[PDB]
Write a protein that binds this DNA or RNA. Structure first.
Lengths: 23, 329, 20, 33, 310
RNA sequence: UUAAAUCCUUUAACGAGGAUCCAUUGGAGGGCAAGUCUGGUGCCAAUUCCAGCUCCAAUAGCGUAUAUU
RNA sequence: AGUGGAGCCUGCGGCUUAAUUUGCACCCGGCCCGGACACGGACAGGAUUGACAGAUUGAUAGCUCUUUCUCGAUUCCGUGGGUGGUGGUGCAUGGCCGUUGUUGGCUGGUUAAUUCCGAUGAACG
């Protein structure tokens, strides 16, 4: 069912964000 | 004793393989190629293809800091230190400072004869983040340096032992991992370290067996941001044993059958510039039928590129041993 | 090996150029 | 390199002797100090 | 496509006085000279920190103690376990010196005493330029960042006269591959020592940006008050001259080999070595004092049927 | 030699095979002198960047900038 | 007159498949053999050759898995970005064919049969 391109659909990009130092 | 010589020879062998074949890794005959290379993807073009900087961040990036605008933060802090007048001890006064919680060892060191200096940190300079520092190898040291071995960093009055990553110094959005520190150009060492505002000099030392630190690098702290990503590249090689008109049958790149199906959406290429796409598995032994743009010679080798985002290892050590005094071997 | 210098380099260049 | 190709085609149309066109037509020999 | 005669083409129709300059240049020169005078007077004088000189011999035949005896106007001979760093007062020349020395190869010692040096005095021998240890030290020192430096040679007059001039010429060539346009002073006598001190005092200072943007100090005196001796942790009283910027106690203090700390109090005792012959001014409180958090404080099939047939 | 010296000159002695006692600086595959070359690295065979080989010029000298002729 | 409509067959695509070869080639399993050079190892304490029987195997087989009998230097293990040789291929290259007339000259079996097989030269232009 999965291959090397469609598996990139299940990756999240919002969990381990470093602390953001504002300006 | 001699195991050090054996490891040195093995490192030399790996270095010459890496300079001769950059990222070609033989496919494992026992483990499935869709398992050992599970955390890999293919890119149509290394420079222009996108990659999310926030994607799949480890536990380590949960522990570090990041600047929303590092340029404007440097501008703000530097204008604050050049313009504002802080109510404190001014330059030239012989002051005494009472600092709270320090081990007795420094005091013993001070009766040895070791110089003990101190400096006041700028704001936000004690928090840890990812330090990107540009280095170049001096010709005095030619021993192999592998990508993630422990080195001694002198960076901006600060000494620490840590394990870096070597990346190419290019202008693109993503940078390829260098598995070895090549002694011809400038590379980027990426490490976990406390924040330091540039300019700062970057000295890299390797600890020898007799206790001396040998100097290997030299440079400047480029930037402080974890958004720089390192990209480990693995190249799989295949042999086109049957050639047809604008068609080939390739073996030895894969060995399972579903390995071919897993890595179908990755564009292929050859050593002689001819690109192509993989059509279909042949069966049960990893043979595949591929469609190229032209005819292929029998000496050609089909190549495949896989990319995985790599990150430094948290080996921050603020202890550096005091060396024996250096002498030429 | 080393290349000749001076009058000898010109002598070599002349022997190559006008002798043959 | 395309500028060199146009100038060589100019010289070809003018009918004088022109170097054969290869992969080393326009390529920087070295940095200049 | 080139149109011919049958196509319609129409040719287009063509259609401060001398005294004012002198006075302006006078004003600009006066401004620049005033600024340079302030900059040169702040270092080594009676209103500023002592001029710190790091003496590094670059060869093994060099007698460092002889050089330090020539470099010492009264001298206050501070001393440690092995090294001899001394305070020098020249009120005839009106300058205050702090002389430290270091042997090449001792990495932390040379790198620390070169990252707080105002000037570096390299020592040479007449015959060769420097050792391989001297070459290694110079590579690390160049790569870290050099302050202003001067080159002194020790044994020219020990040679026979008939070679000396030629020897110096040879030495110049051996220096020129790393120090291209630099004068080789001689350090053999007291007179040459005074000439070297004069060259040191009046010279264009090289400025290092990193230590210029931050407040730093070289510890002249270190005292320990252990809160509990069995705990092996106590307070440090570190006494020295502030060098880089205004020292604010509400920022962290990093000791170079041992990491950063929170500092509590700044008192200002009398200057032990003023140029021309106990009050405390600051407090700790943590209402604005930064905390030493380097890491985030927030935590149906038969038996013989094959899989094919199935 | 010279005020005294150095240098030069003059002379004993040692001092040449890879005579390693090792000549450099620039330019050439678009026109004056001189290229049907090689290998890496990317873009859609052409094509960015890097390192060489070969050739030409003058030579204890040869490039560069600026001004001027 | 049709085809394009319908059923069947067939050709390119596409889909399934281990293969549905391609502009017996394809697939699934089992045999056979696969340099020297250099250096470091084992080797007459024995290197190595052959082998019955039984079995594994879709089947048998010293070409395999057991059990010891024999042959003895006829050797066999590993690492090289070093060549390479039962290799493929072009050129010059020496020999040799074919190419651009005339007149002469029977032991054997077998069949209807001097049938069948079977042994078995000259000159002229």
């Amino acid at each position: 069912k999965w291959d090397c391109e469609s598996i990139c659909s299940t990756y999240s990009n919002l969990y381990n964000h470093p602390q953001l130092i504002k300006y | 004793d001699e195991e050090a010589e054996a490891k040195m020879l093995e490192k030399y062998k790996q270095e010459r393989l890496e300079e001769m074949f950059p990222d070609e890794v033989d496919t494992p005959r026992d483990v499935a190629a869709r398992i050992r290379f599970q955390k890999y993807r293919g890119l149509k073009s290394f420079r222009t293809s996108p990659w999310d900087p926030k994607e799949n961040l480890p536990q380590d990036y949960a522990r570090i800091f990041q600047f929303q605008n590092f340029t404007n933060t440097r501008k703000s802090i530097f204008k604050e230190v050049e313009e504002k007048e802080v109510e404190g001890a001014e330059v030239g006064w012989y002051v005494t400072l009472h600092v709270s919680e320090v081990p007795v060892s420094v005091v013993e060191c001070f009766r040895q004869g070791t110089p003990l200096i101190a400096f006041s940190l700028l704001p936000h300079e004690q928090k840890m983040s990812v330090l990107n520092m540009v280095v170049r190898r001096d010709p005095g040291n030619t021993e192999p340096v592998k990508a993630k071995e422990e080195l001694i960093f002198h960076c901006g009055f600060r000494r620490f032992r840590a394990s870096p990553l070597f990346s190419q110094h290019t202008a693109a959005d993503k940078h390829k991992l260098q598995r070895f520190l090549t002694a011809d150009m400038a590379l980027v060492a990426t490490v976990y370290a406390p924040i330091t505002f540039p300019p700062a000099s970057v000295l890299l030392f390797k600890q020898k067996s007799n206790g001396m630190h040998s100097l290997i690098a030299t440079g400047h702290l480029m930037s402080v941001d974890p958004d720089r990503m390192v990209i480990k590249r693995v190249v799989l090689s295949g042999h086109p044993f049957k050639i047809f008109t604008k068609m080939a049958v390739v073996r030895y790149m894969f060995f399972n059958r579903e390995d071919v199906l897993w890595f179908k959406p990755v564009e292929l290429r050859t050593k002689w510039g001819r690109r192509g796409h993989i059509k279909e598995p042949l069966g049960t032994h990893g043979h595949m039928k591929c469609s190229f743009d032209g005819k292929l010679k029998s000496q050609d080798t089909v190549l495949m590129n896989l990319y995985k985002r790599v990150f430094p290892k948290w080996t921050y050590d603020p202890y550096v041993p005091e060396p024996v005094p250096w002498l030429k071997s | 090996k080393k290349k000749k210098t001076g009058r000898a380099k010109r002598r070599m260049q002349y022997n190559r150029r006008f002798v043959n | 390199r395309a500028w060199v190709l146009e100038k060589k085609e100019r010289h070809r149309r003018q009918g004088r002797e022109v170097r054969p066109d290869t992969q080393y037509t326009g390529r920087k020999r070295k940095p200049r100090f | 496509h080139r149109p011919g005669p049958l196509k319609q083409q129409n040719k287009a129709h063509k259609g401060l006085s001398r005294v004012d300059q002198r006075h302006r240049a006078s004003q600009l020169r006066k401004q620049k000279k005033e600024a340079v005078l302030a900059e040169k007077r702040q270092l080594g004088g009676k209103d500023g920190p002592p001029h710190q000189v790091l003496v590094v011999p670059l060869h093994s035949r060099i007698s460092l103690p002889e050089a330090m005896q020539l470099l010492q106007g009264t001298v206050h001979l501070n001393e440690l376990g092995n090294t001899q760093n001394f305070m020098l007062l020249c009120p005839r020349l009106k300058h205050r010196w702090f002389f430290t020395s270091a042997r090449p190869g001792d990495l932390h010692v040379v790198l620390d005493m070169a990252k707080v040096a105002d000037t570096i005095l390299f020592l040479l021998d007449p015959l060769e330029g420097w050792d391989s240890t001297g070459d290694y030290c110079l590579s690390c020192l160049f790569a870290q960042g050099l302050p202003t430096y001067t080159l002194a040679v020790q044994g020219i007059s020990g040679l026979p006269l008939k070679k000396q001039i030629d020897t110096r010429k040879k030495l110049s060539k051996a220096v020129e591959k790393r120090f291209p346009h630099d004068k080789l002073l001689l350090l053999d006598t007291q007179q040459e020592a005074g000439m070297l001190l004069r060259q040191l005092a009046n010279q264009k200072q090289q400025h290092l940006a990193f230590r210029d943007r931050r407040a730093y100090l070289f510890a002249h005196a270190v005292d320990f008050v252990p809160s509990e001796e069995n705990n092996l942790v106590g307070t440090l009283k570190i006494s020295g001259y502030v060098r880089g910027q205004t020292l604010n106690v509400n920022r962290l203090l990093h000791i170079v080999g041992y990491g950063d700390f929170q500092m509590k109090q700044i008192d200002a005792p009398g200057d032990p070595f003023p140029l021309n012959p106990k009050v405390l001014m600051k407090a700790d409180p943590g209402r604005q004092e930064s905390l030493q958090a380097e890491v985030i404080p927030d935590p149906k099939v038969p038996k013989g049927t094959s899989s094919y047939q199935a």
